[PDB]
């Protein structure tokens, strides 16, 4: 996997995580 | 070098380059000895008598060997105003 793609994936994951956190709040 | 009982140790004392005063090593396959013969009247060049100059390899490699040689010559008088001190 390209590093850039990995980074992108991570970012995507983090968005979801953020959303989850917001929901929890 | 010198032992306490006076007498010398030191297996051989090395030659120093007449231009730099820097020591010539044993595997200095670049260094040189120039022999310039003692001249006489009617030229004739006296047999088995000469002024010797050691040049280290380093100077030769650099290029300023010739100049050094010239300088050396014009202090033993082998050349007459070739090399000038003020450049």
């Amino acid at each position: 996997m390209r590093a850039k793609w990995r980074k992108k994936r991570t970012r995507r994951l983090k968005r979801k995580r953020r959303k989850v956190r917001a929901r929890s709040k | 070098m010198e032992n306490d009982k006076g007498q010398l140790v030191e297996l051989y004392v090395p030659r120093k380059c007449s231009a730099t005063n820097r020591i010539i090593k044993a595997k200095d396959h670049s260094s040189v000895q120039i022999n310039i013969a003692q001249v006489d009247e009617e030229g004739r060049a006296i047999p088995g008598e000469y002024v010797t100059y050691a040049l280290s390899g380093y100077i030769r490699a650099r290029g300023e060997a010739d100049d050094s040689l010239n300088r050396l010559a014009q202090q033993d008088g082998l050349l007459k105003n070739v090399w000038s001190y003020s450049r």
């Binding site: - | 070098m1 010198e2 032992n3 306490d4 009982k5 140790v9 030191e10 297996l11 051989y12 004392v13 090395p14 030659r15 120093k16 007449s18 005063n21 820097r22 020591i23 010539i24 090593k25 044993a26 595997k27 200095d28 396959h29 260094s31 000895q33 022999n35 010797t52 100059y53 050691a54």
Partner: protein
């Protein structure tokens, strides 16, 4: 027996050069190994290692054997020879010859007070080959050689009795280390020390005194 190419060899054969000292002084190139044999009768030959050394071909791989040989007595003379051949014995033999050809003098000295007969090196000397830097330091009497076994052997051969070492870099590649050590040893002459300040004669070379004995006519 022996029949010499090169003027120096011829001279040696004749008996016009008594010791390798003269050769060392006049930086004359020793190109026949027999000269060394003639002049240094007491050379011990130490084989340091034999390692495989490989080359990829379309079919299999060509393996050759690298022989590393140190040569010397105990009176300030050492040679170092690296040789690669396919036969091991042959490689060793060639290496020995190479080492002999190389043979160098050493400036053996005192640590402090010149009581009697030099034991150490005269100066702190370093040698660098590859990455390996071998620092050799003048040690006090009866401290022995303080070195990695390879270097130690070389030191012993040279005839240094007491010496400290500080080998740095990738010392594990033994050949390089050995080379560095050799370089360091060589460096001992060529250091301008106050007990060498004063200018001397500049003798005519044995290649010039006996010019007539040189060349086969």
């Amino acid at each position: 027996g022996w029949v010499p190419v090169t003027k120096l060899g011829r001279l040696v054969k004749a008996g016009k050069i008594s010791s390798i000292e003269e050769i060392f002084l006049h930086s004359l190139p020793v190109k026949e190994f027999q000269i060394i044999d003639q002049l240094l009768p007491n050379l011990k030959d130490e084989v340091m290692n034999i390692k495989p050394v490989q080359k990829q071909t379309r079919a299999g791989q060509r393996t050759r054997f690298k022989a590393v040989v140190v040569v010397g007595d105990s009176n300030g003379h050492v040679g170092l020879g690296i040789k690669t051949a396919k036969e091991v014995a042959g490689a060793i033999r060639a290496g020995i010859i190479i080492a002999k050809l190389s043979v160098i003098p050493i400036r053996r000295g005192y640590w402090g007070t010149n009581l009697g007969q030099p034991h150490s090196l005269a100066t702190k000397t370093s040698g660098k080959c590859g990455s390996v830097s071998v620092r050799l330091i003048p040690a006090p009497r009866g401290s022995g050689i303080v070195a990695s076994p390879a270097v130690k052997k070389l030191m012993q051969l040279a005839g240094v009795e007491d010496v400290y070492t500080s080998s740095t870099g990738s010392t594990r590649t033994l050949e390089n280390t050995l080379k560095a050590a050799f370089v360091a040893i060589g460096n001992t002459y060529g250091f301008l020390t106050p007990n060498l300040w004063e200018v001397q004669a500049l003798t005519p070379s044995p290649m010039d005194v006996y010019a007539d004995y040189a060349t086969a006519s």
